[PDB]
Amino acid sequence: RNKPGKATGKGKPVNNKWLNNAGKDLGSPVPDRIANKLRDKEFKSFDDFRKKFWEEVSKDPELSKQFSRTQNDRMKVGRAPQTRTQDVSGKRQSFELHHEKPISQNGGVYDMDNISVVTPKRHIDIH
Amino acid sequence: MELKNSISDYTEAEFVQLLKEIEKENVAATDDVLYVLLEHFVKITEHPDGQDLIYYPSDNRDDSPEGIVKEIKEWRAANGKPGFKQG
Secondary structure (H helix, E strand, C coil), rough: CCCCEECCCCCCCCCCCCCCCCCCCCCEEHHHHHHHHHHEECCCCHHHHHHHHHHHHHHHHHHHHCCCCCHHHHCEEEEEEEECCCHCCCCCEECEECCCCCCCCCCCCCCCCCCCEEEEHHHHHHH | CCCCCCCCCCEEHHHHHHHHHHHHHCCCCCCCCHHHHHHHHHHHCCCCCCCCHHHHHCCCEEEEEEHHHHHHHHHHCCCCCCCEEEC
């Protein structure tokens, strides 16, 4: 969980509305273009992965354009973008990374094909 | 950037200053201070979209401090609410 590891997976192609369906079922998948930048890279912890993940989003010319300037600034420094106010939940006001298969069951900490992006509300509902 | 009690105590320029402080805290390692500034932003503007004006700006206006001030001014004016201090 908080232990190092290599990221893997292919991810999926996405449109100009990547996070549109993020409070859906399993949310939005890791963009294929993002998985290529992260694949086979060693991370200290999942937190380190998440930080790099969002940085890559801000760096991807196609995805960054789907976010406002302030959103892009956050992600650049490794912070998850803020969700629309309607999708928040308490102090959880930003998109969260979800593991389809929990770390305990089958695990898959850095398996980008087991990671998706969901809103705080969706994460609570799926749980 | 003293947090005023009302948008009426804020000149437009002062509100812009508050927005740049928010942009500064928006790139910090934590959101503790940021969330306080955002809450204040929501309270004073009283805009129904709250912080979405910052993170999810309408494409019919500039995504910048000026665009945010403009949308706030137009919404408050259209609703007969007191606006920014002329100073």
